[PDB]
Structures are given as structure tokens and as C-alpha cells.
Amino acid sequence: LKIAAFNIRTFGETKMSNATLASYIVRIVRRYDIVLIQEVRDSHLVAVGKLLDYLNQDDPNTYHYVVSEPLGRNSYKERYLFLFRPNKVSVLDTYQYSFSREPAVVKFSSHSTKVKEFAIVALHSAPSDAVAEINSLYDVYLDVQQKWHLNDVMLMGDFNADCSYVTSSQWSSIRLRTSSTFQWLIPDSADTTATSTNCAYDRIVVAGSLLQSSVVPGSAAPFDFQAAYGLSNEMALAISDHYPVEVTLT
DNA sequence: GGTATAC
DNA sequence: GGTATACC
Numbered sequence: 001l002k003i004a005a006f007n008i009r010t011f012g013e014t015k016m017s018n019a020t021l022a023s024y025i026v027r028i029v030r031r032y033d034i035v036l037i038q039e040v041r042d043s044h045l046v047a048v049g050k051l052l053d054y055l056n057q058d059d060p061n062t063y064h065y066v067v068s069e070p071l072g073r074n075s076y077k078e079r080y081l082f083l084f085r086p087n088k089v090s091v092l093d094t095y096q097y098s099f100s101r102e103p104a105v106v107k108f109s110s111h112s113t114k115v116k117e118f119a120i121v122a123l124h125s126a127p128s129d130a131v132a133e134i135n136s137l138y139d140v141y142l143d144v145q146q147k148w149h150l151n152d153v154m155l156m157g158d159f160n161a162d163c164s165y166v167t168s169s170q171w172s173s174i175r176l177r178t179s180s181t182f183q184w185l186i187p188d189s190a191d192t193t194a195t196s197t198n199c200a201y202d203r204i205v206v207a208g209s210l211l212q213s214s215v216v217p218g219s220a221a222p223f224d225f226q227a228a229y230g231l232s233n234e235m236a237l238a239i240s241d242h243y244p245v246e247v248t249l250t
Numbered sequence: 251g252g253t254a255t256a257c
Numbered sequence: 258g259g260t261a262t263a264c265c
């Protein structure tokens with residue numbers, strides 16, 4: 001089971017409109033069984049619909065999705081979009097959890113893996129308030145545990161956990177980090193941006209031993225579509241300034 | 251300070 | 258067509 005969290009810079013009607021960009025986006029999503037897409041600025045699900053038309057042109061049940069409402073304090077809004085292969089997994093529940101874009105949490109049943117039921121917390125943090133936000137994920141964690149009696153939780157997204165947004169000294173005041181409950185599959189040494197900058201913005205965190213035991217070592221990593229598709233830096237950036245981070249459960 | 255979008 | 262962001 002392959003899972004990915006992908007921040008697609010301003011996914012919307014414009015981006016999905018360009019048959020080329022769309023082609024690539026589609027190709028990327030298809031690698032996965034469950035993919036979280038962030039930075040969905042689609043008031044009307046017009047772009048999300050385009051995507052699903054492509055994904056499901058050969059069959060209408062290749063992919064189902066769960067999308068959250070537009071999240072944001074003022075006029076700027078983003079949605080959390082969960083795309084999934086209905087034949088490998090099913091939603092058992094979902095809920096909207098201090099945060100700019102409050103985490104959307106989804107619960108999945110997985111028949112084909114060691115771990116059977118697990119939750120995914122999605123987070124696209126605010127750059128300027130990343131520290132506060134990654135730390136609050138500790139609360140969300142506790143929240144999920146209380147509600148669902150579930151220990152197996154994968155927390156992933158464009159957490160902005162590096163460079164200017166989370167410094168070396170700042171990591172100590174982040175509970176999701178200091179707690180040995182959590183294993184950070186994407187190290188601070190990974191490069192997850194398509195730009196020149198070398199930062200580990202996108203991450204995947206896992207709690208619970210069933211899950212932790214279901215992760216295939218050496219499987220979690222950024223997915224550099226530039227290199228994989230021998231795309232030009234300009235083409236690459238046109239798709240997104242971030243790379244998908246992925247993992248494989250067994 | 252810049253770039254960029256949605257709406 | 259100004260406002261509200263995500264980055265550099």
C-alpha cells in the first residue's frame with residue numbers, strides 16, 4: 001500500500017485546464033493507493049472534478065475521494081483532498097479537528113496490510129506559525145486517540161518543518177518531535193522542494209506499533225518527479241515547488 | 251522587498 | 258482589481 005502527501009502549488013481550475021500539467025498531476029496520483037493533495041483552492045470542486053474525470057476515465061471506481069471544506073481564517077482558503085483506491089481501502093469515518101487550516105482526519109480500513117485500521121491527519125501549516133502548529137499536532141493526536149481508541153495514526157503534509165520556518169533550536173519545543181511515540185520517516189536531511197532551496201518541508205510521522213511495524217524500511221522518501229520524468233526545472237515548478245513524500249505499508 | 255493565484 | 262495568502 002503506497003501512501004503520499006502532495007502539496008500541489010495552488011491546484012485549481014487554471015492548473016487542471018492545461019492538458020500538460022494535468023497529464024503529469026494525473027500520472028503522479030496514479031502511483032498511489034491513497035494520496036493527500038494540499039493547496040486545493042477550488043471553491044466549487046471544479047478542478048477536483050476535472051481530476052476525477054481523468055482518474056476514472058477507464059472505470060468510475062478506480063478512485064473515490066474525501067475533501068474537506070475550504071479552511072482559512074480570512075479570504076484565503078484551502079481544502080484537504082484525500083484520493084483513494086476504493087478497492088484497496090475504505091473510509092470508516094472522518095472529522096475536522098491553534099491552526100490556520102485545521103487538520104482533516106480520515107480513518108481507513110486496510111485489508112491488505114499488517115495494520116488493519118489507521119488514521120491519517122493532514123496538515124498544511126502556516127509558514128510563520130509552523131512551530132506552534134506542528135506541536136499542536138500532539139493535541140490532535142491525543143484527540144484521535146480519545147475519540148477512536150486508535151493508536152495507529154500517520155500524520156503527514158507540508159508541515160514547513162525546516163529552513164526559515166523551524167530552526168534547529170526550535171525543535172525542542174515540539175512535542176510531536178521530542179516524544180518517542182512518533183517516528184519521523186522523512187528526515188531533516190531530505191529535500192522535498194522542487195526549487196533550489198534544500199528543505200524538508202513535507203513530512204510523514206507515524207505512531208502506533210502495528211503501523212510502525214507495517215512500514216517497509218527504505219520506502220519513505222520525497223518523489224522527485226523532475227528526475228523521474230526528466231522534466232526541466234521550469235516544467236517541474238509549473239507542476240509544484242514541492243515533491244510528494246511517500247511510504248509503503250506491508 | 252520579490253513572485254504567484256483565486257476570487 | 259484589491260485582498261489574502263504560499264513561498265523566495
Ligand SMILES: *[C@@H]1O[C@H](CO)[C@@H](O[C@@H]2O[C@H](CO)[C@@H](O)[C@H](O)[C@H]2NC(C)=O)[C@H](O)[C@H]1NC(C)=O
Nearest residue numbers: 017018019020021022232233234235236238239
Ligand atoms: C501548460 O503550462 C506550461 C508550463 O507553464 C506551458 O508551457 C510554458 O508556456 C509558456 C508560454 O508559452 C512558456 O513561455 C514556457 O516555456 C512553457 N513551458 C514549457 C516548459 O514548455 C503551456 O503553455 C501550457 N498551456 C496551455 C495550453 O495554455
